[PDB]
């Protein structure tokens, strides 16, 4: 768990935005202590109006494309895993499904040549993912299983670094913001992303005090 | 039970208005001891002319709308639960009826898709509520069952924080005001409301001494 | 017997909801002392309008399915015990009927291969259960014996953690709530469930004071 | 006599199951004091619905097989003692009948080579056992003497560790369970068995409170 | 929170006006302690007749113009985002709507080419802003939604540095002035503005003592 | 028993993955203490959703092939031990059956020339292995004895380094993961394997915190 203390905007105490190291596949937790800034502003503390933004400062575009499939409940799904690796050069394709990042409500039998069968778990209808690795390069395959009636919609293909939709909170009693920071298994080591956090305090009549800071998430491998 | 002692207006002993923590769904009790202020004013003590006012200092507008239905006595009532959640984004709707806040004189069978049947209890005609939770966000559905003749009127859709119409009292013998403070199940944690209390003492000829104070009700979750 | 004291809602004295350890198969007893909250509210104490709700915070879906059978009075019942274990992988099936959780008004002779004979006790018509263990994983088989005339209805397949329908009580004389907490033999160790209790006090004119708390039931093995 | 106090399920005070040392041939007595658990549950104390189960955690399969014979009343019985020791290797067979574990209503004259004559006691018809030791390894021979009319049935070949069918009792006046624990003379030193006890208390209306614990019986030699 | 102590005008203890660092988008709080000047003037302390003035000492004129639109309640509003960037040179226009400074009661879907749709939030009539960034340079777009009857007036296009209309106060009990200092998201880093504060004390007959000071607000980026 | 403490992901304190020495034939135990990482994440501790993966970083392909045979219950089984050693060069074949790794429910009489007789233990039907050593190089022979009816399936030929299917556990009370690490007798000294462990903590609402680490298992001989 990371713990940061914010700069208190007094006119007093290498880059601008502080650093967060991350490993592909992890889901860590970050705590930010606004006490130094929001305590002198004697009021009602923090509020749940935080806003986050992720932007890449170094990306290294991915090699293998992601893909989306669709199936009804109970019916076995097939698909290919070879049109997802447009290769520039000449080489062979060691298709691989890592057991750490396999599916969640199904099973996949990787074939001999870029083929795989996803038998969805019986009595289940939702969305399911798994992360393949075509020759070292990792991507994800997203399958949505329908409840036999119409058709399911299409989920947004998880990004390398993300901040879960609603797992954030603030205790106005001690001025501490908690949020989760998850790294996809397809994040390439060496990249750098930037997270900007806009947090509002509140004065005792309910007006607003805004505070902005950033963090530099550097995707490392091996910790 | 909260117990507050009022400031005695002598010229002597972070915000202005003191604090009251509240949890969604509770109904607590508050006691205020005017002894320090109204005892030196040797007279006939307090009177039952208290006035309350609720105002929000932080609200976080609700996501799901509330709704009103109507039915005659004995006839089963249907309705929908999907036009009450205008969603900005793309997501699914896990309609839920909490058993803690179910109906009071009926039964509701939540369907598969935002549908529900409220069979009113036999030999009963009044108003009945229940609190649904469309994907975490809570609202209320109000149904009024008519005694088969004309039509019932329309109740005012309980607010997040309220002070029951008539459950207040004052013992002029010890200068203590009692009132109840109820929090709706739809109050969003982190909000802050402000309650202003205007209490009149009385002098021994029947003239008036007014006293005003506030309390800051901060809707917390988990106590 | 667990004994909890409730927080008195004064504005004064790791998770939110306190903890209850449980062992699969037990049936324990819990006592909650509302004295700290309901005594200052000088009135008629607690009432028998408690409401409970169980929700899982970690479930670990079961491997072996449960099953339901039916038989008339006196006639011996057969059934299979092999279509209740859809296995992903390749392995053998050591069908087992634990003597601690055998039937109650019958006898079962487990066969060599997933077969069993439930001879219902003579002159008896009701419902009867027993808990099998197909290769470590436990489920229940429910049989209903009919009184030879029509057909019996179908009971609801006991859940991992439950609170018996009517074994709850409150002594308004000392503000203490008693209830029973039972754990099915199929509860998987390591899971966590959450119990929410909504208890109403009453004021001396019969109005209501609601109080809500939770408890985190963590299914442990070996105590 | 062993005396155990049970853990009271309060959320308070190397393996899970406590230990019982046992010596081959003994028959000891065990007392369990449920006072710490069943006294707060003010009710009608314990009931005589205890259930036991024995399972091996280490067995060391026996070398010499057991055997069953049959004879009518008064007629002398012969048998062999050499087809009961399938030996892997080459060695000689020192057949021995220990005087501590001889027969009970007969006499046996061990021959020179694995032969023996069991002359049943005159005017007696029942079942009779004796424990031989073919080269250190112990087994039992069971003979049933018939009352000259038909044929006697076949008894179940006593296990290494057992809990006698009906010698158990509970005093609801002090919450103490008594049971007997017997070890066969053929139990191999160093083994470990596990005994699980399921004891029910009862509430004052007759409902049930279940309690489960285990004990690890470690077959030692020499105490 | 900034805290300044004023010079006491005794004839005793690089630029003239002290310094305040500011970051684009923030809203901070400033406290000025007139105790050193207004305490010797034994009287009735400070009064709420403070006057502020903002003047730029370095501005760096903006590149992209701001804009104003108008719409009635409920009707979706369109507009362009390309006539707001008169470019001197040849380059492309990466239109961007930052999520930190998006709208407040609507939603905007930025198109492919400088187009955007602002669907106002249902049941809402007021003014709404959002800050776009045409190729690094930031400006604001102001939309006013009318309550279907006539037409709304036109708000004054928030300046880079401002002092909120009425959030200022003075405690005559300790001679401390509080005011808020907000920085627009379009303030260009490196600029310098000057704030002049004219504060009046009061003598015990109600006459006046004026005091003037300045502060140099230097718009920095990254704190 | 190995004991590792995990790195706590704070941004603070030759290869990446730590080291585990192993000896062919052993079965050791490993303990990992997640306290440093999962304790600050005040929640419900670890869960039983660990995932392991073994991959070789140096293998040294085996010389002698493994083999599979089949027999019914009670019938003696023959087989050869010479087509399992395709030799490149010219040399003789000192067939050997180590007594440390002999069979478990049978006996094998190694012949003069690569022949052997496996007489299965009477009254036994399962799978049985033994490890031969054709001229220093070790492999395994797997025999499955059928219960005379149909045919048994075919077990998966144990790998050099493995992690037993279900002998893993986690005590959420002290944040410690236990698992077993077994090394086959055919592991070649000097090889290196890599074990990756993916462990999930859980927050107090039941969401997830993932943690990944590796260990480098270096097959040594003589400790």
Numbering used by the authors:
A (entry chain 2), B (entry chain Y), C (entry chain m), D (entry chain l), E (entry chain n), F (entry chain 1): 1 to 13, 21 to 230
How does the study describe this entry?
Caudovirales, the taxonomic order for the tailed double-stranded DNA bacteriophages, is characterized by the presence of a tail—a host cell attachment organelle that is connected to the genome-containing spherical or elongated capsid via a neck. We describe cryo-EM structures of the neck, the neck-capsid and neck-tail junctions, and capsid of the Agrobacterium phage Milano. The tail to capsid junction involves a symmetry mismatch that is bridged by the neck, and is therefore crucial for the assembly of tailed phage. The extensive network of disulfide bonds within and between neck, collar, capsid and tail provides an exceptional structural stability to Milano.
The 15-fold, 12-fold and 3-fold symmetrized maps of the neck were used to build atomic models of the collar, portal, and neck devoid of capsid (portal + neck 1 + neck 2 + tail terminator + collar), respectively. The Milano collar is made up of four rings of gp13 pentadecamers (15 × gp13). The gp13 subunit contains two β-strand-rich jellyroll-like domains. Domain 1 (residues 1–69, 167–230) forms the wall of the collar, and we thus named it the wall domain (W domain), whereas domain 2 (residues 70–166) decorates the collar wall, and we named it the decorating domain (D domain). DALI search results suggest that the D domain of gp13 is structurally similar to glycan-interacting and cell surface binding proteins. Four collar rings are stacked and stabilized by complementary electrostatic charges on the interacting surfaces of their W domains. The W domain of each gp13 protomer is covalently linked to its neighboring subunits by four disulfide bonds, one with each neighbor within the same ring (Cys23-Cys229) and one with each neighbor along the left-handed 12-start helices (Cys22-Cys211). The collar of Milano is structurally distinct from that of T4 and XM1 bacteriophage. In contrast, the Milano collar consists of four rings (4 x gp13) surrounding the whole neck and displaying no fibers or spike-like structures. An elaborate network of disulfide bonds in the collar suggests that they play a role in the overall robustness of Milano particles against mechanical stress, supported by the observation that this stability is lost under reducing conditions.
